[PDB]
Amino acid sequence: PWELTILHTNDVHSRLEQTSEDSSKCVDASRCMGGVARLFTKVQQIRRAEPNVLLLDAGDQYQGTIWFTVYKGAEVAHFMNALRYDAMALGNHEFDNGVEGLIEPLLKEAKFPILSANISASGPLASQISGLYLPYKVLPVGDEVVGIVGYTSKETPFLSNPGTNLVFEDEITALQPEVDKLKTLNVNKIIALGHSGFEMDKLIAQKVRGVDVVVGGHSNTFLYTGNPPSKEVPAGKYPFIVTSDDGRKVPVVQAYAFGKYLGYLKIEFDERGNVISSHGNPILLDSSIPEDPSIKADINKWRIKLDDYSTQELGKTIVYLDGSSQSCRFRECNMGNLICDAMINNNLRHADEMFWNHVSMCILNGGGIRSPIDERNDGTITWENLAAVLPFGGTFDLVQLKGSTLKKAFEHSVHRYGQSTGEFLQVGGIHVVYDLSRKPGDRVVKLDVLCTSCRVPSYDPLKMDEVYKVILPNFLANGGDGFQMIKDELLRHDSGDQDINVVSTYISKMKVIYPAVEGRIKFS
Amino acid sequence: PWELTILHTNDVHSRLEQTSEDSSKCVDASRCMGGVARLFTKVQQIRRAEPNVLLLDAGDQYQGTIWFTVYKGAEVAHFMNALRYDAMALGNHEFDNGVEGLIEPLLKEAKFPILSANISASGPLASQISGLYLPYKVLPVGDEVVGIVGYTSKETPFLSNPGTNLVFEDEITALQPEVDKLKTLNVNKIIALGHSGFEMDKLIAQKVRGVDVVVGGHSNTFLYTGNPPSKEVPAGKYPFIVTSDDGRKVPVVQAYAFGKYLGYLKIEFDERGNVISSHGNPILLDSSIPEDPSIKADINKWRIKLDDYSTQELGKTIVYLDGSSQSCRFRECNMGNLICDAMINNNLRHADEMFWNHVSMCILNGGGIRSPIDERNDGTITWENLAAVLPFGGTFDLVQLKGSTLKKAFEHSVHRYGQSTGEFLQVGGIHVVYDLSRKPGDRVVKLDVLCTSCRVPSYDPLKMDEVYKVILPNFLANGGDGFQMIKDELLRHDSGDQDINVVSTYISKMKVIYPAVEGRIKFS
Numbered sequence A, B: 001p002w003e004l005t006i007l008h009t010n011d012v013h014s015r016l017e018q019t020s021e022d023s024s025k026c027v028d029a030s031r032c033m034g035g036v037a038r039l040f041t042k043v044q045q046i047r048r049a050e051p052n053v054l055l056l057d058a059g060d061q062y063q064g065t066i067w068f069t070v071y072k073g074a075e076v077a078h079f080m081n082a083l084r085y086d087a088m089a090l091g092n093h094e095f096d097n098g099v100e101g102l103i104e105p106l107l108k109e110a111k112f113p114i115l116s117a118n119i120s121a122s123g124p125l126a127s128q129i130s131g132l133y134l135p136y137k138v139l140p141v142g143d144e145v146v147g148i149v150g151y152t153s154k155e156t157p158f159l160s161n162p163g164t165n166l167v168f169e170d171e172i173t174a175l176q177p178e179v180d181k182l183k184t185l186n187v188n189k190i191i192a193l194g195h196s197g198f199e200m201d202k203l204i205a206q207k208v209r210g211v212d213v214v215v216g217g218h219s220n221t222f223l224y225t226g227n228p229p230s231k232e233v234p235a236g237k238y239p240f241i242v243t244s245d246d247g248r249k250v251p252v253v254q255a256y257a258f259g260k261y262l263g264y265l266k267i268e269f270d271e272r273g274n275v276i277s278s279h280g281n282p283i284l285l286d287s288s289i290p291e292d293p294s295i296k297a298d299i300n301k302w303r304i305k306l307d308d309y310s311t312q313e314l315g316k317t318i319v320y321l322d323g324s325s326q327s328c329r330f331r332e333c334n335m336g337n338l339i340c341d342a343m344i345n346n347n348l349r350h351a352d353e354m355f356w357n358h359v360s361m362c363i364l365n366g367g368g369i370r371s372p373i374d375e376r377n378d379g380t381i382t383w384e385n386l387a388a389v390l391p392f393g394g395t396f397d398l399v400q401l402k403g404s405t406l407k408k409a410f411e412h413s414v415h416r417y418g419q420s421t422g423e424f425l426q427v428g429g430i431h432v433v434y435d436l437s438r439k440p441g442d443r444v445v446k447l448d449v450l451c452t453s454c455r456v457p458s459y460d461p462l463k464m465d466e467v468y469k470v471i472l473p474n475f476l477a478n479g480g481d482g483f484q485m486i487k488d489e490l491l492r493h494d495s496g497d498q499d500i501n502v503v504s505t506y507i508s509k510m511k512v513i514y515p516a517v518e519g520r521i522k523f524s
């Protein structure tokens, strides 16, 4: 039997530096986790021990910290090249800076193949991008070869900025003919590496004949066999076994997000390329693994421009930005309005005749707003200032919620009003009126929402049975501040851009901001 | 006696081409008026006949048409140089593109002195601008000399974009020592040429000892002796005689605006430079005066780039821009919200600790909105498109109104609701609620306005006795659409930027717009 060790990362999301256990900024260095220097140490160790190793990334290196804001993917090429990745699939966030922001910094500088079989280009872009990403690559491993076939979320147009010159095809449709073609080229060991989420990964393992292993991402899925080593709760065993339509057992793996774990799967293959066995587990990259000194010194050299950037003027405010708790946990606050307006601006996606924009609505817990910004520094706003407002290292995510769920959230928002609790909601594209004299759970007396399926945006009453797209902090999507109803009832969730970066980009675009308190939230 | 002919213009406001009688676009060429080609013919005729002539401009050549949008003052230098102006005073609108937009295109290219005695600079700007404008110039006229001493509105910081490196001093304070100095230099014939408005011009004639003549502007004041030749109604005789503190009669002149008239004043001086007599009248530049063929051909050559510019993309809308009458004469319309938001953005002026901005409020009659803009041309918006929405050639002016006056305006807005009349008001920084079941004059049931004297903008009830700054179309300032109360009760009025240009600049700055109907106007 021929044994392959697959090492894999996904959804690293700009966590170049080691992080806290929750993937936010490292504060107590002695307990920090992840980062590329630590990953380098672990990968190097494994490569000393195991003859046949592949190191794969399932996409979404782009977007997540000030590293991506400043270096715009140059950091991803540089540090993935330094760790000698063997292949990467394109993720949705690889399109955040458009096609031009993918071609240059990443496709032109990577020393490893970048893969997606279900993305096609037309017109002059097709010539410009031809060959810079591939449907698959056949890689030599020892005296054998392994085919790696890539895929990217069909939903990428709603979740990034790929432009109107790329088409994202159904994954299974696109993959099958490529996997069949590899068989004709005497390639009997095939890995599907891609970025569509655990549910689609299971469908690909079931339906794409010839796929031996699926290495996925997007959904930040944690899988583990045994007692978990940290706070993440497994969604299933590692690997997750799918029974294929052809009767085979096909392992499906993912490794959470944020570079906290290195996925590690050992596969035994027979001579015909059938999987005989699979076993492994993600490895927690904790402080018991030393950061590689050479990688750490280069990280520290690259950090200098980040530190300089953090104190530069992004734009100006002519108004006090009221992020005080006394305001934002009790009533509409202009900092809340600013952040929700930035959230909706970040989620403007491709023009379509059925909606002016796919999403119009935003909620933001007042407990997520942790500082005001004074306008009396010549109006200046810096990244440092925004990091005090939004200190938790989160994302502004896209969810689908029934109106009933959103009514429950707004009831929760005021269920114990008056104690300066974090659940009070700031909003955009929503007009709410409370009557605090009513019983808890029955305090929402008006709730109107901005249409999407309309050429002129206007407010209509919320419909309990209708599904709404909402932009909200990942903390709330995950049921933080008691919003268990959002976690338990949401119909779709896709992780969005870094919180600070969403606001910084909006401020830079607007140049001079002056958010008002305007009646989005009223009391009767 | 030594006789001087003073020819003067003021507040030409980018009317390079001949115009309709109301200073809008020329449609029936055979009845059009003004324009620089026609002015050239008249000035040339007078200079053939009169030995001692000065041609003076009292400021505000900048701002008013697509000529200024495209050429940014290069057109003013070129065509004022072609008409051989002898001197110009700086107006407030000469600061619309900041100091840099005055230095280059106008101060560096004019072949005549540009004057203001009451503007001082500090820091490195003082070195950069030194000598490029002057407090006064002594000009040879025949065998005599005439001193021309300039001045500019003290209010210019509120009415343009001069920046924080220029100080506008009290006019009379600044002028007196310069006029005294000219006396010491044996200059006994002194013209004060400046841009502060008729009321200040009368104070300068009264109080500045040694001033022989005041040539003013800013207030678009029409003065005439006898039957007026067109539709403008005189504010007084031409010249307006002020009795000075020293006992002299001092003529004050102005010549309306828009290049429709050439001011013409004949002065007789004795040997000591005392005015013995003054008489004249503005000359209507109507179609009985031919356009100079050479100037007209150069105007037609320069028009080519204007025509090309008019169809270029300014920005994009992802929403239908609903400027239909069926919407904007009956209810809040998103085109109205867009235009009022552009009006407030245009009037963001220098940061101060007593207000986030000096003005927060906007009204716009629905009768002034004359087209929608469809978003289905790839979202494109062009200047041509905006000219269909705003076809009348107006300005968005700054006024001061008691709250009582504004309540009367909002009552007027709905006094005969339901007939698709033009008086219905679109708004910004104002939230109004009507109850149409109430009697006409008593239909406004809530009227809240955005604070200015506040660090966080928020809405408070309108106060009947408080004075509010409001941005509104000059049509309304002049009592159009039945708003006689605005005309009769306003406390201050300053003419603002070209309507189309205000919206085009906002669209360009924003790049992608998506104005909503959001509850600024409600019915109960």
Ligand SMILES: [Ca+2]
Pocket: A188, A189, A190, A210, A211, A212, A272, A273, A274, A275
């Ligand atoms: Ca196989």
Ligand SMILES: [Ca+2]
Pocket: B188, B189, B190, B210, B211, B212, B272, B273, B274, B275
């Ligand atoms: Ca004199």
Ligand SMILES: [Zn+2]
Pocket: A011, A013, A060, A093, A218, A219, A495
């Ligand atoms: Zn991701």
Ligand SMILES: [Zn+2]
Pocket: A060, A091, A092, A093, A195, A217, A218, A219
């Ligand atoms: Zn993803």
Ligand SMILES: [Zn+2]
Pocket: B011, B013, B060, B093, B218, B219, B495
């Ligand atoms: Zn003017």
Ligand SMILES: [Zn+2]
Pocket: B060, B091, B092, B093, B195, B217, B218, B219
């Ligand atoms: Zn003026």
